[PDB]
Amino acid sequence: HDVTTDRSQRLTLRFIPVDREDTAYSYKARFTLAVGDNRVLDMASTYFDI
Amino acid sequence: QAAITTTPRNNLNPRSWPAALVYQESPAPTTVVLPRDAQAEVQMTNSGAQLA
Amino acid sequence: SIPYLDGTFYLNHTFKKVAITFDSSVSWPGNDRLLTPNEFEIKRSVDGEG
Numbered sequence: 001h002d003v004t005t006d007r008s009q010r011l012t013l014r015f016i017p018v019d020r021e022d023t024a025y026s027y028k029a030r031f032t033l034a035v036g037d038n039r040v041l042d043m044a045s046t047y048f049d050i
Numbered sequence: 051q052a053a054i055t056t057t058p059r060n061n062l063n064p065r066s067w068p069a070a071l072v073y074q075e076s077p078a079p080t081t082v083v084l085p086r087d088a089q090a091e092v093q094m095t096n097s098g099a100q101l102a
Numbered sequence: 103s104i105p106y107l108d109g110t111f112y113l114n115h116t117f118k119k120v121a122i123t124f125d126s127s128v129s130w131p132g133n134d135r136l137l138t139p140n141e142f143e144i145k146r147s148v149d150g151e152g
Contacts, residue, residue: 024149025149025150026150098128100128100132
């Protein structure tokens with residue numbers, strides 16, 4: 001009960017590049033992703049899907 | 051109300067008009083600090099340690 | 103004509119890329135200000151017209 005959550009929250013998040021890039025040699029995956037202030041986004045488990 | 055709302059008529063229509071009853075807009079500033087200091091930045095970037 | 107004795111140079115366009123690296127490692131334009139801080143490009147070698 002001390003280290004638990006009985007609240008409504010997500011587990012897996014997906015975001016898209018707001019600024020899509022279409023150049024000859026690069027794609028800028030431009031995310032405007034804000035971390036939840038009562039959430040903990042694990043930079044250990046943050047990856048891209050192509 | 052003509053004597054209450056305004057001071058009695060002297061110059062009935064003056065274009066060259068100073069402010070006394072006609073109000074000059076609010077005089078109050080709100081000042082905030084900076085995330086970075088004025089003198090604590092000279093030690094690093096040009097020497098080696100880059101600041102970001 | 104000597105190109106220096108009258109200030110009459112000719113070869114002032116035919117460059118490509120210049121890397122000014124201070125003390126053999128840290129770059130001078132490396133203050134994030136430009137798109138290529140490591141090697142500031144003089145005349146582009148046709149990379150992407152945009």
